[PDB]
Design a protein around this ligand. Structure first.
Ligand code: NDP
Ligand code: NDP
Ligand code: 1CY
Ligand code: 1CY
Lengths: 516, 516
C-alpha cells in the first residue's frame, strides 16, 4: 500500500539494537567471601562442581541437549581459562568466551594439546579483547542472540567485579553462589553482593529465591556448604501480584447471567519500564507471546478476520468468532470469524463503513495510527496523540466492544511512553497478555518514529479474578518474580505492517513452571 | 421522551443524614473542661475568641440574620451556665440538648418579654443528643441557611462529638488551654490518638498552635490556642502530585513559548459518600462554573454563550470569531463550539450543522444507555462514554481534555473513573474533580444508587511554568476537610436540574494566593 502504510524510518534498527546481553553468575566462596587462592581454589567440592557443570550446560526444557545452534555460553577471565587443565579445555557443551588482552581466539586454540582437537573445538572457543561488558556486547550480536540461550559469568576476580557494578549489573538476571565452610583458605578476593539501599547496589535489591539446607560433601573432609540463587527483586511484576492478592482478599463478588463468578475492584494503574530492550512478560506464569505478537501485528494492520490468527494456530478469537456467537450478536451477515470493525479496524479506519473483512478499506475512515506516527516525528509534545477503538456508532456492528479501547503516547528525552485504558481486565490470563501487547506496540511505534521505548502505564477499570481462578492464582502468588526478559529484532521492514512474529525474538525468559 | 426521567428514590439517594459541625472548647493542662458546675476560669481573650469564631460568618461582609447565621449546640447544663440576663447567645441559633426542657421552657427562663419574643427565633430545644441535633440541623430549614455549627459544650456532648457517628462529621476542633491555678474539674477532653481504634481511622492534626499568650485579666494567666483538623489524605494525593511534578517534571515549551513541567500517568481516588464533595481546600474552586458547565454538558449543549451569559466565561477564548475561523469553522456563529463534549455524550456521531438544530434522537445517547444498564444490569462492564470521536474533532472548536469516563457498581454505590488526557494541575484538575463528582452524584440519583467513589486517571499532567511560585505557596497549606453537597429540591428529569437546586455547605477553603 506504501502510502496507506507507515514507512519505517532509517533509524528503524538504531533505537532497539541490543547493546548488552543479559546473564547469570555462578561462583563459590568461603564463609568469609574469599573466592580464590590467587590462581587456584584450594577447595574443590564434588557437589558444587557437578552443580556448576549442570547449571551452565543444561537448557530450559529438559530433553534438549546442547548443540551449535542452541547452547549456553560462559565468560571467563584469562587467568581462569588458564586454570583449566588443557585436557578438559574447553568446557564441553558450551560456548567458551575468554576475556584477554594478550590472547587471540587463535592463540587459545594453539594451547589445546593437538590440532584435531583444535579443529573440533573451533566453533566453541572465542577470545574478546575487553572485559565483561565488551563480551556481553559481542554476545548480543545476531550471531549469538538468540543462539546462546543463557550467558553465565563463570568467574575471575576481575570479571565478578565488572559484573556486580553498573553497567553490567543491570543485566545480571541471577546470582548462583555456593558457600563452602572451608577449614582454612582465607584467600585474597572477596565476592560481595551489594546490599539493598546502598550506592553500590545501584537501586537493585538482591533477594534470595532459594537457599539450600546446609549440606555435607562426600569429599575427604565432610566439608559443609549450601547454595543460594539470588535475583534482582522485581517491583514491577509485584505491582501485578499485589493487585491480584487485593482483589482476592477484598474484591467484590459477582455472578453474571451465565452464573460466571468474579471478584473485582475498580480503578488501578501499573508502570512497566521498556528501556534497553526490556519486555515485561510476567515470570510467575508463562505468557503466550506468539499469540500476543501475532494479534498485535494483526491489529496495526487493520484486520478483522480472526481466521488469520486461528490459521497461524492462535485461537484466542474462535469463541467470539464462531457462527453461534456471531448469531447471538445479530451479526448473521458476517462470515464465521469475521468480527466486524473491531480493534484494529477502528485503529486504522475510524468511522469507516464496514461490510465484510475482505473488502478494500484503504483510505477509509480516520487512520489514527498513521497520524500518531507523524505527530511524534514533528511535534513530540503534542498532547492529543491517542487512539481509540471505542466507537459507539460501530459498536453494535462489532463481535464485542474492545477491552483495551484507548491508548496515549508521551514523549520526553527521546523516549516513547504509552498509557493504556482497559475497561475490563481479567487478571489471570488477560492482563499479562495485554501488558505484552501494548509493550510491543510502544516498541514497534517507537522504532517507526525515531524514538527509544520508554514506559508502559496501564489503567485498569473493572479488573477481576475468576472464581475458577482463585486457587491457582493463589498458588502463583507464592512465587517471587524473577527478572524480566528482553526482545530483539533479527530483521527490520520497510513498513510497520510488514513485521512478522518471526522477525523478533524473546531472549532470557525464565518463567516459573505450570502451576500444579 | 429524549430526556432522562428521575426515579422516585431520587431524593433518598443523597439525603443529608447529619449536618457537619465544629467544636470549641477550653481546658487546663490536664484536660479539665470545668468542675461540671461551671467553668472556674474567665480568660477574656478566650471569650472574645469564642464569641468571634462562633458568631462571625465566612463572608467577611454579612451580618448574622436568621436567614444566614451560625448555630451553637450545647447541653442543658451549659445553657443554664449562661446568665439568664445573657440568654440566648446573641446572633447565633441557640440549640440546647435536654430531655426535660422545651423550646418554650428555655424561653420563659429569660426575664422581660421584649426579648422573650425577639428571641423565639434564635432559640430551639432538641430532646436527644448531639447526633439528633446534627440530624435536625440537616433538615431543609437549617441547611444551608446555617453557615456553620459549633458544639460549644457539655462534657456529655464533647464525648459524643469525639466518637462515631458524629466524629466523621467534625470539621475541626478549636482548643484553648489555660494554666489553671485551680484544678477544680472532673471531666477531661481528649482527642483520639492517631491509629487507635477510638480514632476510627481519623488522624487529628494541628493546623495552628499559637505562642504562649498572657491575658490582660490581672492574673497573668498563661494560655494558648489550637486548631486541629481531620487529615485529608485525598487532597494530599493532589498536593503530592503537584510537588512531584514541580520537583521532577519534564520542562517543555509550547510552540508559542508557553512553559510546563510534566509527568505522564497518575491516578487519584475521591470518596463521594454521604454527601461528601471533594472540592480542594488549599485553593477555592469555582463551583458555580463547574456545576453550570456540567449541567451544560448533560444537556448536550454546544453553545457557550449560554454559559458566558451566566458569568462563566471559561469558553470565551475558544468561542471567538477568531479562534473559530482558524479552525476553519467559518460558518459557526460566534460562541458555537461545534459538536464537543455534551453533544458527543448525548448525540455521539450525529452530523453537526449549527447549535440551533434539534438533535433530539440523533447519534448515540451514551448517557441514556448507561442510566438504563445501571438500573437493570449494574455489573455490565461496558458502562463508559467517550467524547473522543476522531471523525468529528475537526469540527470541534477544541478536542475534549477529559474525554472518557466509566462506571462501576458495588454494594449499590456508584463509582466513576474519569480519563483526562491533558491536565492543568493549576486550575483544571481541581475543577474537573469537582465536575465528575457532581456528574457521578447526579447519575446515582438518576439510577437509584448511592454515590460511591470517583477515580481520576491522568495523562499529561502539567504545571504551567509561571505557576511554580504560587503552587509552591499552596503546597504549604495542610488540606482541610472536604465540604458536602446537598439538594434543596429535585427534578422530574436530569436535563432539568439547575445550579440553584444544590447547595455546597461547609466549604472553608484557604484565602487567595498572595501572588503579589
Ligand atoms: N570460587 C570461584 O567460584 C572462582 C574462583 N576463581 C579464582 O579466582 C582467581 C582468578 O581470578 P583473577 O586472577 O582475577 O583472574 P581472572 O580469571 O579474572 O582473569 C583476569 C584476566 O582476564 C582478563 N581481563 C579482565 N578484565 C579485562 C579487561 N577489562 N580487558 C581485558 N582483559 C581483561 C585479563 O587477561 P590478560 O591477562 O590476558 O590481559 C586478565 O589478566 C583464581 O585463584 C581462581 O582459582 C575463579 C573463578 C571462580
Ligand atoms: N471550659 C469549657 O470550655 C466548658 C465548660 N463547660 C462546663 O461544663 C459543665 C458541662 O456539664 P456536663 O454534665 O459535662 O454536660 P452538659 O452541659 O452537656 O450537660 C449535660 C446535660 O445535657 C443534656 N443531654 C446530654 N446528652 C443528652 C441526650 N443524649 N439527650 C438529651 N439530653 C442530653 C441533659 O439535659 P437534661 O438533664 O435536661 O436531660 C444533660 O443532663 C458545665 O458546668 C459548663 O459550665 C461547658 C462547656 C465548655
Ligand atoms: C565449580 C566452581 C568453583 N563453582 C562455582 N559455583 N562457580 C564456578 N564458576 N566454579 C568454577 C567453574 C569453572 C572454573 Cl574454570 C572455575 C570455577
Ligand atoms: C468561652 C469558652 C470557655 N471557651 C471555649 N474555648 N469554648 C467554649 N465552648 N467556651 C464556652 C462558651 C460558652 C459556654 Cl456557655 C461555655 C463555654
Amino acid at each position: 500500500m506504501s502510502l496507506f502504510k507507515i514507512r519505517m524510518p532509517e533509524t528503524v534498527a538504531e533505537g532497539t539494537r541490543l547493546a548488552l546481553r543479559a546473564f547469570s553468575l555462578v561462583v563459590a566462596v568461603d564463609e568469609h567471601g574469599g573466592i580464590g587462592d590467587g590462581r587456584s581454589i584450594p577447595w574443590n567440592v564434588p557437589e558444587d562442581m557437578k552443580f556448576f557443570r549442570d547449571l551452565t550446560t543444561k537448557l530450559r526444557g529438559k530433553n534438549v541437549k546442547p548443540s551449535p545452534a542452541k547452547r549456553n555460553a560462559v565468560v571467563m577471565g584469562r587467568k581462569t581459562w588458564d586454570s583449566i587443565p588443557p585436557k578438559f579445555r574447553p568446557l564441553p557443551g558450551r560456548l567458551n568466551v575468554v576475556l584477554s588482552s594478550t590472547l587471540t581466539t587463535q592463540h587459545l586454540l594453539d594451547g589445546l594439546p593437538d590440532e584435531e582437537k583444535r579443529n573440533l573445538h573451533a566453533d566453541s572457543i572465542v577470545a574478546v579483547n575487553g572485559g565483561l561488558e565488551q563480551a556481553l556486547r559481542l554476545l548480543a550480536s545476531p550471531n549469538y542472540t538468540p543462539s546462546i540461550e543463557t550467558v553465565y559469568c563463570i568467574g575471575g576476580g576481575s570479571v565478578y567485579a565488572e559484573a556486580l557494578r553498573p553497567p553490567c549489573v543491570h543485566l545480571l538476571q541471577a546470582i548462583y553462589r555456593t558457600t563452602i565452610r572451608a577449614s582454612e583458605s582465607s584467600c585474597s578476593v572477596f565476592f560481595r553482593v551489594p546490599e539493598s539501599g546502598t550506592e553500590a547496589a545501584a537501586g537493585i535489591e538482591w533477594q534470595r529465591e532459594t537457599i539450600s539446607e546446609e549440606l555435607t560433601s562426600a569429599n575427604g573432609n565432610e566439608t559443609k556448604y549450601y547454595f543460594e540463587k539470588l535475583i534482582p527483586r522485581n517491583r514491577e511484576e509485584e505491582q501485578y501480584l499485589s493487585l491480584v492478592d487485593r482483589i482476592i482478599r477484598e474484591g467484590n463478588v459477582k455472578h453474571d447471567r451465565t452464573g460466571v463468578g468474579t471478584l473485582s475492584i475498580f480503578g488501578a494503574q501499573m508502570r512497566f519500564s521498556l528501556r534497553n530492550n526490556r519486555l515485561p512478560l510476567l515470570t510467575t506464569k508463562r505468557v503466550f507471546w506468539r499469540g500476543v505478537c501475532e494479534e498485535l501485528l494483526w491489529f496495526l494492520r487493520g484486520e478483522t478476520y480472526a481466521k488469520k490468527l486461528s490459521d497461524k494456530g492462535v485461537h484466542i478469537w474462535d469463541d467470539n468468532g464462531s457462527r453461534a456467537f456471531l448469531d447471538s450478536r445479530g451479526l448473521t451477515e458476517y462470515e464465521e470469524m469475521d468480527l466486524g470493525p473491531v480493534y484494529g479496524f477502528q485503529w486504522r479506519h475510524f468511522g469507516a463503513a464496514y461490510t465484510h473483512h475482505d473488502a478494500n478499506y484503504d483510505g477509509q475512515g480516520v487512520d489514527q495510527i498513521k497520524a500518531i506516527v507523524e505527530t511524534l516525528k514533528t511535534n513530540p509534545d503534542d498532547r492529543r496523540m491517542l487512539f481509540t477503538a471505542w466507537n459507539p456508532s460501530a459498536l453494535p456492528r462489532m463481535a464485542l466492544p474492545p477491552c483495551h479501547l484507548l491508548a496515549q503516547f508521551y514523549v520526553s528525552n527521546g523516549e516513547l511512553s504509552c498509557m493504556l485504558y482497559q475497561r475490563s481486565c481479567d487478571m489471570g490470563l488477560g492482563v499479562p497478555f495485554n501488558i505484552a501487547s501494548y509493550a510491543l506496540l510502544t516498541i514497534l511505534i517507537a522504532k517507526a518514529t525515531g524514538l527509544r521505548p520508554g514506559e508502559l502505564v496501564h489503567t485498569l477499570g473493572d479488573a477481576h479474578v475468576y472464581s475458577n481462578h482463585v486457587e491457582p492464582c493463589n498458588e502463583q502468588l507464592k512465587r517471587v518474580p524473577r527478572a524480566f526478559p528482553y526482545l530483539v529484532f533479527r530483521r527490520e521492514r520497510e513498513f510497520l505492517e510488514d513485521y512478522e512474529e518471526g522477525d523478533m525474538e524473546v531472549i532470557d525468559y525464565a518463567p516459573y513452571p505450570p502451576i500444579s
